[PDB]
Design a protein around this ligand. Sequence first.
Ligand SMILES: [Fe+2]
Ligand SMILES: [Fe+2]
Lengths: 254, 254
Amino acid sequence: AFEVRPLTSALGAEIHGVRLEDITDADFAELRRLLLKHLVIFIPDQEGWSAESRIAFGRRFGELEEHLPHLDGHPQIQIIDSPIWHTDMTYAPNPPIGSVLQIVDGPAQGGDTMWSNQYLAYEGLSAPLRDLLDGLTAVHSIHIPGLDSQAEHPVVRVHPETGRRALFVNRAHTSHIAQLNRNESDALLQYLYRFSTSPEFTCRYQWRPGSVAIWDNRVTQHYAVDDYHRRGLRVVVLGDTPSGDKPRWDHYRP
Amino acid sequence: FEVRPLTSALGAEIHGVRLEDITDADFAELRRLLLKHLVIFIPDQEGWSAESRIAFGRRFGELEELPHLDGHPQIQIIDSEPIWHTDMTYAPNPPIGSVLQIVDGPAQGGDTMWSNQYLAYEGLSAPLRDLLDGLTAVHSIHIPGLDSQAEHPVVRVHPETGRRALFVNRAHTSHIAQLNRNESDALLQYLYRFSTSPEFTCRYQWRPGSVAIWDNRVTQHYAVDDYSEHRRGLRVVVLGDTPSGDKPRWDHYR
Ligand SMILES: [Fe+2]
Ligand SMILES: [Fe+2]
């Protein structure tokens, strides 16, 4: 078994002795299990990871997103270049399952990424509040010049592979709770965003060249710190369907 | 009687009344108006006798007996020597109502506002009402010479109307027992702000001789602090309330 060095009690772990290039299905299974346990894993010293290897590794988890700048003749490998808590693309009915990011160059310090644990954010709530959120759904939307999209998702979702409940609201894309009036929804979401990202549920990763970060976009939010040029390669695994309880109330009608 | 309501929410001014020698039949109508309007205002009751006042108040229940009129501890004196509150909710048996007459004061300033706790509750969406029905709160007071506390349902049923009404107020409610203190604070903040919106309140302007009778079971009152003129008033406090509601749906937080 690999050597694991966790970041925080909540989530994140650095995995050592991994060579993603010609990795075996057996070693990959151990990584899928560590991802489920730790929610976000960091594999350092992966400089020189080939395009074909990056593809097949992402392809192990599911379907990749294809285009946004990409490596020549590899639209599944995105080019990240150059500050709010968010869960990737939740304004869509089927948000991504997870992502694989590799910082290929940059400064030794500055540009840290933080991740939060939505299992603990849900568990941390008291029982009357956890019951209330189980029967609620929220609309997630984005309205920029080249995109007007939205999607309803339960406030509390179950991880399909863990069977554990997680909060499914994020400051960036969550618009409003459907079954509550806009005012009640504002007040409740304001508390939930503050709560869900309290230090106890997060981890902060300092990037090093060659570092790979693979995370679960079902049970985490992430935040890129604006404390500092940086380039990275990102593969996006799609296929999420945030499922939860049947809402116990009709949509709020004004 | 001539009845002139202040707002759609609560409050009505009654004309053509003489409290001094009121009949049981006219009082039956006042009692009906108090249950319909929550706070009623009776003007031109100057020189109302002390024994008549005590016989009138005794029609609702037992009177409280400190500054009082000579030979009458049942009649408290308020000689003015700024927060939404329901009277003595920190006690296990808060009062059901009060009868206050303004003997002498300025023409403007010192207006008192009242709010409808029935509307405060109804105005919440279905999921919020469900939550509050199964919750209770500790109401406390901590000053030199008076250290009392009591737990009351967040939503209570008025024993005469059968109607549910919110039972939390900024001045005396400390926290909701079944939630942690942070969730409790956040929820109460929305609640105090909401329960007192203009739509649920009324503002009465006092004139020497005006009498206000109110239902402390389903109202909050506020004393506007905007005048430097001395104002004397005479209060008769009716005791006997036991705020009842639904048994908590969860245990107290740990
Ligand atoms: Fe992202
Ligand atoms: Fe008062």
